[PDB]
Design an enzyme around this catalytic site. Structure first.
Site, PDB file in Angstrom:
ATOM      1  N   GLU A  56      24.551  15.197  14.706  1.00 28.40           N
ATOM      2  CA  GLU A  56      23.366  14.454  14.313  1.00 28.40           C
ATOM      3  C   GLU A  56      22.577  15.178  13.161  1.00 28.40           C
ATOM      4  O   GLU A  56      22.223  14.579  12.131  1.00 28.40           O
ATOM      5  CB  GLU A  56      22.479  14.286  15.549  1.00 28.40           C
ATOM      6  CG  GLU A  56      21.073  13.776  15.302  1.00 28.40           C
ATOM      7  CD  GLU A  56      20.277  13.819  16.585  1.00 28.40           C
ATOM      8  OE1 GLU A  56      19.649  14.873  16.833  1.00 28.40           O
ATOM      9  OE2 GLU A  56      20.396  12.891  17.471  1.00 28.40           O
TER      10      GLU A  56
ATOM     11  N   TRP B 293      16.067  16.652  12.264  1.00 27.28           N
ATOM     12  CA  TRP B 293      16.253  15.211  12.081  1.00 27.28           C
ATOM     13  C   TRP B 293      14.892  14.467  11.835  1.00 27.28           C
ATOM     14  O   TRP B 293      14.774  13.537  11.006  1.00 27.28           O
ATOM     15  CB  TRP B 293      17.059  14.652  13.230  1.00 27.28           C
ATOM     16  CG  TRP B 293      16.396  14.550  14.586  1.00 27.28           C
ATOM     17  CD1 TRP B 293      16.580  15.337  15.729  1.00 27.28           C
ATOM     18  CD2 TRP B 293      15.545  13.453  15.007  1.00 27.28           C
ATOM     19  NE1 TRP B 293      15.874  14.845  16.757  1.00 27.28           N
ATOM     20  CE2 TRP B 293      15.185  13.719  16.368  1.00 27.28           C
ATOM     21  CE3 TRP B 293      14.960  12.343  14.338  1.00 27.28           C
ATOM     22  CZ2 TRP B 293      14.355  12.853  17.098  1.00 27.28           C
ATOM     23  CZ3 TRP B 293      14.160  11.465  15.059  1.00 27.28           C
ATOM     24  CH2 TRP B 293      13.845  11.722  16.410  1.00 27.28           C
TER      25      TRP B 293
ATOM     26  N   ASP C  69      27.677   8.164  16.874  1.00 22.44           N
ATOM     27  CA  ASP C  69      26.503   7.688  16.166  1.00 22.44           C
ATOM     28  C   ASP C  69      26.242   8.575  14.944  1.00 22.44           C
ATOM     29  O   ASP C  69      25.823   8.037  13.896  1.00 22.44           O
ATOM     30  CB  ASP C  69      25.268   7.616  17.062  1.00 22.44           C
ATOM     31  CG  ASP C  69      24.768   8.943  17.581  1.00 22.44           C
ATOM     32  OD1 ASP C  69      25.566   9.889  17.861  1.00 22.44           O
ATOM     33  OD2 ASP C  69      23.490   9.041  17.748  1.00 22.44           O
TER      34      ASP C  69
HETATM   35  O1  LIG Z   1      19.296  12.319  23.346  1.00 23.11           O
HETATM   36  C1  LIG Z   1      18.622  11.553  22.338  1.00 23.11           C
HETATM   37  C2  LIG Z   1      17.867  12.459  21.329  1.00 23.11           C
HETATM   38  O2  LIG Z   1      16.802  13.109  21.991  1.00 23.11           O
HETATM   39  C3  LIG Z   1      16.019  13.935  21.169  1.00 23.11           C
HETATM   40  O3  LIG Z   1      14.960  14.512  21.970  1.00 23.11           O
HETATM   41  C4  LIG Z   1      13.937  13.613  22.406  1.00 23.11           C
HETATM   42  C5  LIG Z   1      13.958  13.570  23.903  1.00 23.11           C
HETATM   43  O4  LIG Z   1      15.135  12.893  24.341  1.00 23.11           O
HETATM   44  C6  LIG Z   1      12.748  12.827  24.378  1.00 23.11           C
HETATM   45  O5  LIG Z   1      12.720  12.999  25.806  1.00 23.11           O
HETATM   46  C7  LIG Z   1      11.575  13.654  23.876  1.00 23.11           C
HETATM   47  O6  LIG Z   1      10.420  13.156  24.427  1.00 23.11           O
HETATM   48  O7  LIG Z   1      11.480  13.409  22.473  1.00 23.11           O
HETATM   49  C8  LIG Z   1      12.584  14.116  21.908  1.00 23.11           C
HETATM   50  C9  LIG Z   1      12.468  14.008  20.404  1.00 23.11           C
HETATM   51  O8  LIG Z   1      12.647  12.687  19.884  1.00 23.11           O
HETATM   52  C10 LIG Z   1      16.788  15.003  20.440  1.00 23.11           C
HETATM   53  O9  LIG Z   1      15.859  15.577  19.557  1.00 23.11           O
HETATM   54  C11 LIG Z   1      17.937  14.352  19.717  1.00 23.11           C
HETATM   55  O10 LIG Z   1      18.652  15.433  19.166  1.00 23.11           O
HETATM   56  C12 LIG Z   1      18.772  13.510  20.687  1.00 23.11           C
HETATM   57  O11 LIG Z   1      19.819  12.836  19.993  1.00 23.11           O
END
Ligand SMILES: OC[C@H]1O[C@@H](O[C@H]2[C@H](O)[C@@H](O)[C@H](O)O[C@@H]2CO)[C@H](O)[C@@H](O)[C@@H]1O
Ligand SMILES: [Ca+2]
Ligand code: NA
Ligand code: NA
Length: 635
Positions: A51, A618, A223
């Protein structure tokens, strides 16, 4: 002005690329996050992910767009190849692979205590109808796709090929079903030399077998590969818009992108190439495309025995499909845009079928309110069990509706972020093609989002964060689609996730741009996009980018016990123990030396949630590029 929003992007780009801010490792690859203590999908912030690499491509593609300098994009692709796509030496035994017998079945289980899962050599696995043709196309049995997870600083001590030293180190975590949260894994090397773990390394945590061999294996995140391809489609257009030549600016990269999307087709098949609709694990497997769903499933994976005494290799697709992974932009590029069409016969046809099927899938999952429901599975309970009678009618080309595909801790349907990531892509498709299905989706999805944003007194905002679902879609019928009047979503929590806020801004701006070009203007969408972007700029500046504080009460789980079998005795590379009294922290005791850890302990010791302000690669990329994106569309 365009120039102001472009300046905001450039300021952000500068912050991300200033070594003082710590976004990149010693090897020049992005970290997940600047901050080290963070647990969510990776389990340390100095891991990295496919990602993150895909977003690195996006970041440098917009830098190209804005400045004319494509060297940053060349660099990013090269760093991807160097770091995250296994070299031949790292995937040395694909010559053992037999596409007629791609893998051996093991059940998935409803708890990590279900594992290790027994390999069942009497259970039929279908035929892989693509690998032999891919090997002929590229002159090699190797896979050209990104593994999903790296350890950028060698914090777990595995190095590569069992060396304990090389970086970025290929690692993996998740292996024990839907209830194995990020808190419940055992982090292990992709190269299994039995150096760490128990006498047979980490293997007996996951699969039971009479014999264990040394081996290598990788796990794709479709993805992220799809996103990489989407970025290159846009990069090509931007280069041409400057009157430049993509073969001079990014030599070889469109061909490598089309190769990656060629192998990415492995994600379109059931895990064990079982026929769509399979409801008994004992069923004879698919032949040809009987086992294709044509969507971006949760993973594909590939692996091989270290040596000829064992002499096997495997490939698997996935039987879980989440809406949040779909990508009509990648599918349209790989099927229709000559410079990105893969060369293997069939591959343009599979991606054309994918593009259609993905638009049917978004339609089938659209709630009464506008949000998109989770997805679908071809393997009920990860054992091809019969479809439950309470959702037996709720099907999509043989698969059954699943409100939380893949994981349940927390539910994969409950995160709002998937809405934004995947609907941005529909919005882009509406913009590019004036597509009627995309329009209809976004006409229903955009105002559901808008209606659930809270504008705060100080000029700030909170976006939707957490969702709750009830009900099921109607049986899918492409010829006569039904209204999903009994599929409902509520927004039960809000937050200030700026990465997701930026992705909402982008979905809204493409939707507004598309509407002005093709239908009636949608000024509220356009204004909401701009407000989000302006509110982020004026409320959430930090020395490193744009970030909002976030409460992480979930970090109490640092101290949770983790399932390890009684028979399993193992060590982590730093000598931490793997046994039946292990906890997330006790197998990761490096965290005891992290400055943020004391802050977690102190907070939890005070009865309070810890609070952090994170700079996720990201997100900072999404936010930075959203300014450029708005300027490109509207100025
Ligand atoms: O697994 C999906 C995505 O999650 C990301 O972290 C999120 C987390 O899942 C959510 O619980 C939290 O509240 O917010 C964070 C940030 O958006 C993670 O950063 C991604 O790498 C991952 O693909
Ligand atoms: Ca050849
Ligand atoms: Na490589
Ligand atoms: Na769990």
């Amino acid at each position: 002005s365009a120039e102001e929003y472009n300046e905001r992007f450039m300021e952000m780009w500068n912050k991300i690329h200033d070594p003082a801010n710590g976004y990149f490792s010693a090897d020049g690859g992005p970290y997940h996050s600047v901050e080290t203590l963070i647990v969510e999908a990776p389990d340390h912030g100095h891991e990295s992910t496919s990602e993150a690499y895909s977003y690195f491509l996006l970041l440098e593609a917009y830098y190209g767009k804005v400045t004319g300098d494509w060297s940053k994009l060349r660099n990013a692709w090269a760093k991807m190849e160097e770091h995250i796509i296994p070299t031949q030496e790292m995937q040395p035994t694909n010559n053992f692979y037999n596409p007629s017998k791609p893998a051996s079945y093991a059940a998935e289980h409803a708890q990590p205590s279900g594992y290790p899962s027994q390999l069942e050599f009497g259970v039929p696995v279908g035929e892989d109808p693509i690998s032999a043709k891919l090997a002929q196309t590229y002159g090699s049995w190797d896979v050209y796709g990104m593994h999903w997870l790296l350890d950028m600083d060698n914090i777990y001590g595995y190095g590569n090929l069992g060396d304990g030293v090389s970086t970025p180190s290929y690692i993996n975590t998740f292996q024990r079903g839907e209830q194995e949260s990020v808190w419940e894994t055992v982090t292990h090397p992709s190269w299994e030399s039995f150096k760490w773990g128990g006498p047979n390394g980490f293997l007996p945590l996951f699969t039971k077998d009479n014999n264990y061999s040394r081996q290598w294996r990788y796990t794709n995140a479709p993805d992220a590969d799809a996103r990489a391809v989407q970025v290159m489609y846009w990069a090509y257009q931007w280069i041409k818009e400057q009157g430049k030549d993509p073969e001079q600016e990014v030599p070889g990269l469109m061909a490598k992108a089309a190769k990656m999307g060629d192998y990415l087709r492995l994600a379109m098949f059931d895990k064990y190439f079982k026929k769509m609709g399979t409801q008994d694990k004992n069923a004879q497997g698919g032949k040809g495309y009987e086992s294709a769903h044509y969507l971006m499933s949760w993973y594909y994976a590939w692996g091989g025995a270290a040596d000829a005494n064992a002499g096997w290799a495997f490939r698997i697709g996935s039987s879980h499909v989440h809406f949040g992974y779909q990508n009509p932009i990648a599918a349209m590029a790989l099927s229709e845009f000559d410079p990105l069409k893969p060369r293997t016969p069939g591959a343009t046809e599979d991606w054309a079928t994918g593009l259609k099927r993905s638009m049917e899938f978004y339609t089938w999952l659209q709630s009464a309110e506008g949000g998109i429901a989770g997805g679908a599975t071809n393997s009920w309970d990860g054992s091809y069990k019969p479809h439950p009678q309470d959702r037996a009618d709720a099907t999509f080309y043989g698969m059954v509706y699943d409100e939380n595909p893949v994981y349940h801790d927390p539910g994969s349907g409950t995160w709002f972020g998937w809405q934004a990531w995947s609907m941005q892509r529909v919005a882009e498709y509406y913009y590019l093609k004036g597509d009627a299905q995309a329009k209809q989706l976004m006409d229903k999805w955009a105002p559901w989002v808008l209606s659930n944003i809270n504008w705060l007194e100080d000029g700030s905002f909170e976006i939707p964060a957490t969702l709750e679902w009830t009900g099921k879609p109607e049986k899918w019928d492409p010829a006569n689609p039904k209204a999903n009047t009994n599929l409902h979503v509520s927004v039960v929590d809000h937050g200030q996730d700026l990465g997701i806020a930026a992705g909402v801004a982008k979905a809204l701006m493409f939707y507004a741009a598309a509407a002005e070009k093709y239908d009636t203007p949608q000024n509220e969408a356009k204004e909401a996009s701009k407000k989000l972007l302006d509110a982020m700029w004026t409320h959430f500046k930090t020395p490193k980018g744009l970030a909002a504080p976030e409460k992480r009460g979930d970090y109490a789980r640092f101290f949770d016990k983790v399932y390890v079998p009684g028979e399993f005795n193992g060590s982590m590379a730093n000598g931490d123990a793997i046994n039946s009294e292990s906890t997330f922290l006790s197998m990761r005791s490096f965290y005891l030396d992290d400055p943020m850890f004391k802050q977690v302990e102190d907070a939890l010791n005070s009865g309070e949630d810890p609070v952090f302000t994170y700079h996720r690669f990201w997100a900072q990329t999404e936010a930075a590029t959203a300014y450029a994106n708005y300027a490109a569309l509207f100025e």
